[PDB]
Design a protein around this nucleic acid. Structure first.
Lengths: 394, 394, 48
RNA sequence: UUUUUU
RNA sequence: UUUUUU
RNA sequence: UUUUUU
RNA sequence: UUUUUU
């Protein structure tokens, strides 16, 4: 009767937020891994330049352990800040890892431990020398930068160090946009971002890393989750306005503008196209369940919080519920109308197992052959029937 | 008159929740079985790696007693946590078994009891040696991992131990999805999940157990209920958000996303297809009783609590009332419209004794030949009669 | 007439009333489609 | 799970 | 009791 | 009194 | 990202 079909809606709403309530216990505590991070102790430009060169070499090194690579990545990311240790310690929310901040102090060819020399330090020094030697020998004499003069470059001016560091941060931060979604199909959007930032003169093109180093760093970023979590935390903190933003922070926020809502193109495309742009072909007895699921998904997305846009980057378990597969019909309709309407829509790889070609064809027809689609008109267009006819005439 | 046919609804509602009230007594207490669990006492990676290798061997062992197999499974599942004993003791709700947590301490080829050596310990040591020998001899020299180098591998780095342990937990947790529903028809969805997690780089494919070991572990999991109860409790605890989630916890929750609502495909398919997607062929004097039963089932499901989705895994007696057989007509209609609408729907084995082919045909016709199915339109589509005609034209 | 499983029940009682059994058998199939009060307005479902 | 543009 | 997809 | 399915 | 006028 009347009561049923509403009890169903309440049941689905309750099932969506079924057990996602309360607070968990500390028993489910992940084992922690020690990660050694080399941060610059002082503000001298030469020390910071040598440190970032060392971090580039370590990241490029093939014999480097994963923990050393994560340490080098953390050193690189926090290089712009005047207090990298404070930035790392105050913007770390990774239960998987524990970070031991190490102030570099002075600067040799590698790093001088300067803590009980001879006792448990010489082995670390030889290890760092081996890492550097393997990094330099692995490449065919090619420096990490696309320009050989950028590697063996002496930096003593603060402005030059700042420019080079900003360029390195920009080139690193380009990769996060398509690091886990489709790392193989990258180097096109990344090149577009690099060209955009070069044309804006925000980055000096002299310090441009080669594509081999970029591929290695992207592979490291995709393999590791702690680096992604740290960078997402940095993005969230920068997104919060209120204070003055520096050049590095502004570049990071501009990149995060592209980073947001990555890996969830299906859901947002479904929203924008199938749900909005109201077409008379919506209520047809095969889209009502999908509409209810979509509404529940919007409520869940609002409930998640500030980490919702970067759900794929943090690899949230909630992301699976957002993926198409629970609403294949409306999703297929929406991507059909998207591919017919948006030219850019159509390069997306959507050869899934629930394509529903009938509904894709229905959406394709609904986009063009359906009708002009005159929605409720606040202004009284009494004589616009001929206008609608002319618009549909194309 | 008017009063009757409502007294009937009240009678059925009261009959559904007939005697499910009050609190039971302690007289009906199941006999408890002692289960010995070997947990790592320390955090040294080599000890944990040797312990999980021992647990793999014990699970693969054919001469192992069932209690030893359950102990090995509990050791494996709680291996990721830094305090496996606390995790087991704080997440155990099995009245059938009692768990005696045993800290391993040091690590020999097997396990050193290190408690009154010679007195009631030598026999246990010989038993463990026999278990290991039988496990190694039973296989044709094949290690549990698909790679022979993964077995005799020395682990001293924490990161490598964490990666291997996470891979083992993932491969174990894949099996729970189809362990009791259709264990024989597995290895397809399990392989799909493994490929998904490999492509996401969450699991290192080097530590990939062979299919023989996976089949043995799945058989053990299906035979035993205590392991299933413990893993369901872990899933419920992880599902409760609020705290930071580690890599193991995130993988477990992502797997539990697929685990949820398993073994109850008939009921949920009936809901989604027959009840929702409102078709004019619903109220036909043979579906009203099924609708009332379905509403009562929704109320019961809401009343059950957080354990409702994993009813088949815990083998609840309430699950029988949810199974089709009490509403065969609406169920047949719903599966008919599902097989006509959803391409994936149709691989389900539904050759039951109450198929009602007439109603299945009626649902098949209702899906396509019935009508376009225009539901109540909030937007006034005065000119969409031709749109509906074109949509029905297909 | 409706439930296939219904029919294995032994109901050869002394008050079977064959006339009413036949009436029920006809009511199950030959009576009508049996459209009950429809909350949703199916104005065009006569052909359905 | 993911593969557009921005 | 259960045998899809996710 | 009872003889189905679940 | 941007390419008018004012």
């Amino acid at each position: 009767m009347s009561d049923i079909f509403d009890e169903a809606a309440s049941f689905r709403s309750y099932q969506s937020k079924l057990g996602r309530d309360g607070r968990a216990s500390a028993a489910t505590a992940t084992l922690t891994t020690k990660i050694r991070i080399f941060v610059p102790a002082t503000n001298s430009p030469e020390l910071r330049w040598e440190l970032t060169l060392f971090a580039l070499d370590v990241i490029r090194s093939p014999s480097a352990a994963e923990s050393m690579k994560i340490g080098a990545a953390f050193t690189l990311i926090s290089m712009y800040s005047e207090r990298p240790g404070a930035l790392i310690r105050s913007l770390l929310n990774d239960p998987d890892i524990e970070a031991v901040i190490i102030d570099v102090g002075s600067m040799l060819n590698g790093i001088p431990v300067m803590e009980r020399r001879g006792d448990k330090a010489q082995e670390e020094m030889e290890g760092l020398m081996r890492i550097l030697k393997t990094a330099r020998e692995s490449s065919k004499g090619k420096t990490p930068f696309v320009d050989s003069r950028a590697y063996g470059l002496r930096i003593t001016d603060m402005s030059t160090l700042v420019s080079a560091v900003i360029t390195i941060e920009a080139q690193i931060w380009i990769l996060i946009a398509k690091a886990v979604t489709a790392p193989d199909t990258a180097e096109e959007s990344e090149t577009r971002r690099w060209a955009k930032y070069v044309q804006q003169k925000r980055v000096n093109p002299f310090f441009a890393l080669t594509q081999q180093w970029l591929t290695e760093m992207r592979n490291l970023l995709s393999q590791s989750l702690s680096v992604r979590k740290f960078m997402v935390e940095i993005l969230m903190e920068v997104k919060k306005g209120g204070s003055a933003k520096g050049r590095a922070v502004e570049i990071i926020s501009d990149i995060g503008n592209y980073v947001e809502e990555t890996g969830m193109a299906g859901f947002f495309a479904t929203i924008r196209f199938g749900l909005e742009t109201r077409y008379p072909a919506l209520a047809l007895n095969e889209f009502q369940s999908d509409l209810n699921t979509i509404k529940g998904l919007m409520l869940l997305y609002r409930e998640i919080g500030p980490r919702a846009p970067y759900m794929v980057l943090l690899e949230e378990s909630i992301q699976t519920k957002f993926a198409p597969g629970g609403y294949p019909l409306l999703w297929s309709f929406a991507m059909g109308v998207a591919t017919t309407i948006d030219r850019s829509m159509g390069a997306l790889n959507i050869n899934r197992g629930y394509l529903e070609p009938m509904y894709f064809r229905l959406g394709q027809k609904s986009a063009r052959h359906h009708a002009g689609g005159i929605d409720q008109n606040m202004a009284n267009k009494l004589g616009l029937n001929s206008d609608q006819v002319a618009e549909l005439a194309a």
